């Protein structure tokens, strides 16, 4: 990507990165006083409780859902390091009906080898590099229970758009910093 950018710049052209196919969404507001529409949208995304997030496939259907829950969630484009740290620290794989930690590659293999994923690294690759079995891996991963950001959210008031100096909204590149503090 960087080589293509340099070539375009040196040849009187402006290379544009492909629109990100993966986003990370973290709940920012509580349960009380949530209108039914955003409440149902968050429920479908498995954002049961505040300071919890899940990986969402970037699609026009999911984009419209995110548009509705915009005031209540903060999301962006996670980096490889952030995804790896999340999977290694808060990585809990869904088994029949219980939340079991991914403490060994054997556990992942016994419940996700049907699709060729048999190790935590393979799951991380499928998540960051959205593949055909992205939905299966995303559903298999339990929603991440994230702590509050160490050092504060960095804004006087959370309930404002990121463009307006708040916390929610689109923080595409700054989502990694928030995730690292919250992880």
């Amino acid at each position: 990507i960087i080589q293509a950018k340099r070539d375009a710049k040196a040849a009187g052209s402006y290379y544009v990165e492909a629109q990100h196919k993966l986003v990370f969404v973290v709940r920012i507001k509580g349960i009380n006083k949530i209108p039914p529409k955003p409440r149902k949208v968050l429920q479908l995304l498995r954002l049961t409780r505040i300071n919890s997030g899940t990986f969402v496939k970037v699609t026009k259907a999911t984009l419209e859902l995110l548009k509705l829950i915009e005031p209540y969630v903060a999301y962006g484009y996670p980096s490889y390091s952030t995804i790896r740290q999340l999977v290694y620290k808060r990585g809990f794989g869904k088994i029949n009906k219980q939340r079991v930690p991914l403490s060994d590659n054997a556990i992942i293999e016994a419940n996700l080898g049907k699709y060729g994923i048999l190790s935590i690294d393979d799951l991380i690759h499928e998540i960051i590099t959205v593949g055909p079995h992205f939905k299966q891996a995303n559903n298999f991963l339990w929603p991440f229970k994230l702590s509050n950001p160490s050092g504060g959210w960095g804004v006087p008031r959370k309930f404002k758009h990121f463009i307006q100096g708040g916390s929610f909204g689109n923080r595409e590149e700054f989502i990694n910093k928030l995730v690292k503090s919250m992880n």
Binding site: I31, Q43, T48, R49
Partner: protein
């Protein structure tokens, strides 16, 4: 946050309401068989044992003959979880083995006369641990006034 009920109980029974000692022994035996055999027959028999008296209508001896007339069912063993009641409407009873919790005096006498052999559920399980060559008959439920 929650989406379903805070705490939801299972929609199936665990132990019979009756305190009969012998019935509980059969329940224990069938639970062990179902857990260590996974046979659908054992699971069905275990589930039927938890049904109440109303939900366990008696099966007439004529109804046993009804099933035995099916193609290939002449030699199948008939298992009735409830009680087998006699029926004078049938004048000839095919010679067959019947397994049930309780057998009425008339039904037992008719079965013995017809060359059959009344048997308890435990004996049937001993003969058929996996429920092979077994037939299950459930008595009419709409018959009871409701």
């Amino acid at each position: 946050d929650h989406t379903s009920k805070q705490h939801k109980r299972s929609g199936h029974r665990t132990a019979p309401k009756s305190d009969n000692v012998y019935l509980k022994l059969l329940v224990k035996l069938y639970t062990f068989l179902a857990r260590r055999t996974d046979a659908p027959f054992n699971k069905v028999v275990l589930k039927a044992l938890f049904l109440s008296k109303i939900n366990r209508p008696p099966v007439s001896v004529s109804r046993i003959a009804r099933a035995l007339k099916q193609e290939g069912a002449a030699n199948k063993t008939v298992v009735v979880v409830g009680t087998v009641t006699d029926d004078a409407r049938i004048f000839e009873f095919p010679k067959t083995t019947v397994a049930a919790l309780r057998f009425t005096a008339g039904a037992r006498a008719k079965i013995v006369k017809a060359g059959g052999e009344c048997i308890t559920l435990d004996q049937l399980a001993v003969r058929a641990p996996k429920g092979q060559n077994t037939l299950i008959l459930r008595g009419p439920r709409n018959s009871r006034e409701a």
